Design an enzyme around this catalytic site. Structure first.
Site, PDB file in Angstrom:
ATOM      1  N   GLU A 118      20.546  10.446  15.794  1.00  0.00           N
ATOM      2  CA  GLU A 118      19.522  10.724  16.794  1.00  0.00           C
ATOM      3  C   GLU A 118      20.046  10.601  18.218  1.00  0.00           C
ATOM      4  O   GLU A 118      20.933   9.801  18.486  1.00  0.00           O
ATOM      5  CB  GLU A 118      18.335   9.776  16.612  1.00  0.00           C
ATOM      6  CG  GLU A 118      17.584  10.001  15.328  1.00  0.00           C
ATOM      7  CD  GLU A 118      17.713   8.846  14.375  1.00  0.00           C
ATOM      8  OE1 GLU A 118      18.041   7.732  14.786  1.00  0.00           O
ATOM      9  OE2 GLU A 118      17.451   9.107  13.026  1.00  0.00           O
ATOM     10  N   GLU A 138      10.148  14.103  10.130  1.00  0.00           N
ATOM     11  CA  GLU A 138      10.670  13.421   8.959  1.00  0.00           C
ATOM     12  C   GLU A 138      10.109  12.003   8.879  1.00  0.00           C
ATOM     13  O   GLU A 138       9.629  11.455   9.882  1.00  0.00           O
ATOM     14  CB  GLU A 138      12.213  13.437   8.916  1.00  0.00           C
ATOM     15  CG  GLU A 138      12.918  12.763  10.056  1.00  0.00           C
ATOM     16  CD  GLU A 138      14.427  12.914   9.981  1.00  0.00           C
ATOM     17  OE1 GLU A 138      15.131  11.891   9.936  1.00  0.00           O
ATOM     18  OE2 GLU A 138      14.920  14.058   9.977  1.00  0.00           O
TER      19      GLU A 138
HETATM   20  C1  LIG Z   1      17.470   8.573  11.744  1.00  0.00           C
HETATM   21  O1  LIG Z   1      17.929  10.721  10.718  1.00  0.00           O
HETATM   22  C2  LIG Z   1      17.164   9.509  10.593  1.00  0.00           C
HETATM   23  C3  LIG Z   1      17.529   8.805   9.309  1.00  0.00           C
HETATM   24  O2  LIG Z   1      18.868   8.382   9.403  1.00  0.00           O
HETATM   25  C4  LIG Z   1      19.529   8.193   8.168  1.00  0.00           C
HETATM   26  O3  LIG Z   1      19.557   9.426   7.476  1.00  0.00           O
HETATM   27  C5  LIG Z   1      20.235  10.455   8.229  1.00  0.00           C
HETATM   28  C6  LIG Z   1      20.081  11.761   7.487  1.00  0.00           C
HETATM   29  O4  LIG Z   1      20.572  11.662   6.158  1.00  0.00           O
HETATM   30  C7  LIG Z   1      21.698  10.051   8.476  1.00  0.00           C
HETATM   31  O5  LIG Z   1      22.285  10.982   9.368  1.00  0.00           O
HETATM   32  C8  LIG Z   1      21.773   8.659   9.091  1.00  0.00           C
HETATM   33  O6  LIG Z   1      23.126   8.255   9.186  1.00  0.00           O
HETATM   34  C9  LIG Z   1      20.969   7.656   8.279  1.00  0.00           C
HETATM   35  O7  LIG Z   1      21.038   6.356   8.866  1.00  0.00           O
END
Ligand SMILES: *[C@@H]1O[C@H]1CO[C@H]1O[C@H](CO)[C@@H](O)[C@H](O)[C@H]1O
Ligand SMILES: [Ca+2]
Length: 516
Positions: A172, A367
């Site tokens: 993010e 999401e």
């Molecule tokens: C904060 O995309 C939101 C969730 O984060 C988690 O899942 C992501 C997507 O699979 C990943 O990029 C991230 O590392 C993980 O902590």
């Protein structure tokens, strides 16, 4: 939905792939079966993290896209689509992270100073992603990585529906303001992350550039700074969050702090579009984290958002619009609490983001923040997604529904839906000038019987003399609805006598007609 309209006709459902590699969680053959099953349940594509720590592990330009290519072949085999996430962030350490994939270790040796990592108010060092201040290294490495990735995925362009960029920690666009090691985990106030010498001098140079000289700085701030070296970020994060932010100094500092994220957005956006546009021609998106705690804290308003870099969302979204990136917001499954000690106002947050997004004409996606194991949450996501014009929703994560047919079934019903255009007609409605006609129904797509802000408006058909509208409904779902009149003052004047139904809504466009 808000402002008399229905659900987004482009709505799609996505599913998050595991954090670890498929062959470590299951096998390719089973994975393909799983994908066909997910597709059966309304999922359009699977989002997947392709870790920088894997793709350019051993050294600069020593790329390894073999896993990504293999993954794409199975997706192709299962007749599905995919949304790769170019994860320039570390896997492991964030909420729900079952993995350990730090970024390439050779990267840290590219600088002698402390420009590449983060330093909190209390001296905590963060290295799970590159500090956006190091734009020179970012432009080089991300440019090289994005370009190399594009080349490797060119053969599978047909199964790629969208591309996600990692704008920071956990993927993010934000600062690593909330971490266990820094003592800033939820529901605590966050800590500012601009305490490296590099960050200090950058802010200082930014201020001097804006005012020209210390003499002008002191005039603007009503301060008595003795030297330029006195120009520095907040000495006390708590006091700054209590009242410091209100001063000219606080405003300037917050402008710079968030500005770094805005500049970063425009950068990666530029690099991404240059590397992907001609080849894939798919939308590119980036994420904004949902920092819901300390939202309505009376003493420290937004004590978690500000340290994360979120000061003015309107300005932040303008950056996405300029960079031509679609925005994705998390936390759609939660509702407002706003009570001590957490002061969590998650639902309010999403509503403002959605309003701003739609207002600026930015494509919005969402999401869930945490794993859902109860259908009530799906219902909450449905209300937000279908009433606030979301183009897509991504479910975290794979294993939750893949191995729980009950949850999977509930997801299919509530969220794994296909939007289809239909015509609603109401004959002989007793209206007088100033009267508008609406319909509302049981499902979230229909506003859930709400008459205040979510009803779907109908319009008078001069030609045939009846009230009708082109509404987007979920295909193959049973619905119940009733029409009602609203007077010029905005109050419900009356209701349709008998409750209408469509069991189910047809897959093909047609019309439902009934008399008042
Ligand atoms: C904060 O995309 C939101 C969730 O984060 C988690 O899942 C992501 C997507 O699979 C990943 O990029 C991230 O590392 C993980 O902590
Ligand atoms: Ca490189």
């Amino acid at each position: 939905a808000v402002n008399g309209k229905g659900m987004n006709p482009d709505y799609k459902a996505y599913l998050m792939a595991p954090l670890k590699k498929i062959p470590e969680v299951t096998n390719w053959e089973t994975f393909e079966n799983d994908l066909r099953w997910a597709k059966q349940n309304g999922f359009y594509a699977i989002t997947v993290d392709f870790w920088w720590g894997d793709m350019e592990k051993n050294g600069d330009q020593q790329f390894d896209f073999s896993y990504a290519q293999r993954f794409a072949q199975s997706v192709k085999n299962a007749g599905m689509k995919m949304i790769p996430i170019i994860s320039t962030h570390q896997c492991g350490g964030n909420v729900g992270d079952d993995c350990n994939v730090p970024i390439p270790s050779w990267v840290w040796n590219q600088k002698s100073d402390d420009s590449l990592y983060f330093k909190s108010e209390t001296g905590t060092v963060n290295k799970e992603t590159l500090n956006p201040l190091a734009s020179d290294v970012i432009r080089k490495e991300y440019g090289e990585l994005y370009t190399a990735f594009a080349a490797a995925m060119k053969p599978y362009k047909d199964v790629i529906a969208k591309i996600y960029l990692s704008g920071g920690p956990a993927g993010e666009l934000r600062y690593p303001s909330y971490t266990t090691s820094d003592g800033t985990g939820y529901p605590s106030r966050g800590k500012f992350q601009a305490y490296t010498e590099f960050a200090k001098s950058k802010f200082r140079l930014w201020v001097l550039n804006k005012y020209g000289s210390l003499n002008e700085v002191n005039k603007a701030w009503g301060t008595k700074l003795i030297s330029e070296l006195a120009i520095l970020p907040p000495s006390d994060g708590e006091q700054f969050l209590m009242n410091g932010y209100l001063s000219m100094y606080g405003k300037d500092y917050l402008e710079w702090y968030q500005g770094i994220l805005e500049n970063h957005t425009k950068l990666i956006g530029e690099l991404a579009h240059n590397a992907f546009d001609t080849t894939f021609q798919v939308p590119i998106g980036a994420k904004i984290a949902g920092v819901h705690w300390q939202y309505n804290n009376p003493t420290i308003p937004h004590g978690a958002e500000k340290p994360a870099g979120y000061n003015d969302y309107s300005h932040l979204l303008d950056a996405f619009k300029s960079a031509k990136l679609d925005v994705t917001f998390t936390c759609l499954e939660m509702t407002d609490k706003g009570s001590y000690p957490e002061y969590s106002m998650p639902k309010t947050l999403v509503q403002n983001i959605a309003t701003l997004a739609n207002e600026k004409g930015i494509v919005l996606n969402g999401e869930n923040a945490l794993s859902i194991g109860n259908e009530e949450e799906y219902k909450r996501v449905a209300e937000m997604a279908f009433n606030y014009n979301f183009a897509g929703f991504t479910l975290l994560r794979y294993q939750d529904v893949m191995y729980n047919n009950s949850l999977m079934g509930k997801f299919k019903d509530l969220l794994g839906v296909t939007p289809v255009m239909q015509t609603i007609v109401v004959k002989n409605v007793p209206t007088t000038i100033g009267d508008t006609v609406y319909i509302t129904g049981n499902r979230a797509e229909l506003g859930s019987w709400d008459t205040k802000q979510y009803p779907i408006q109908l319009y008078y058909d001069s030609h045939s003399n009846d009230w009708r509208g082109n509404v987007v409904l979920p295909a193959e779902r049973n619905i119940e609805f009733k029409a009602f009149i609203k007077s010029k003052d905005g109050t419900v004047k009356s209701w349709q006598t008998i409750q209408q139904s469509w069991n189910p809504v047809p897959l093909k466009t047609t019309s439902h007609t009934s008399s008042w």
